[PDB]
Amino acid sequence: ELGDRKGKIHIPFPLANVTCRVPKARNPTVTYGKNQVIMLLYPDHPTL
């Protein structure tokens, strides 16, 4: 015994843009050659 009769209430925990803290990979052992570059990558965690 009701059509589209409804109320509304404000909800906690909204989405907001914050700032995430990350780290920087450690420099790799770099050696130069004839038109080529060699890198010895030592990652602690999955690094792109």
Binding site: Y32, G33, K34, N35, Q36
Partner: protein
């Protein structure tokens, strides 16, 4: 800066081994004779002309 009877030291960049070039100081030109040698590195980390 110039004064009278003196000299000047200049830095120059070239690609040729045998370089015969004219340098225009103020309004007068001078001929420079140079026999440049190859560098130790084949690949460089900065661009040039």
């Amino acid at each position: 800066e110039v004064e009278g009877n003196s000299q000047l030291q200049i830095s120059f960049s070239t690609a040729l081994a045998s370089a015969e070039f004219r340098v225009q100081v103020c309004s007068t030109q001078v001929h420079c004779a140079a026999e440049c040698h190859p560098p130790k590195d084949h690949i460089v980390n900065y661009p040039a002309s």
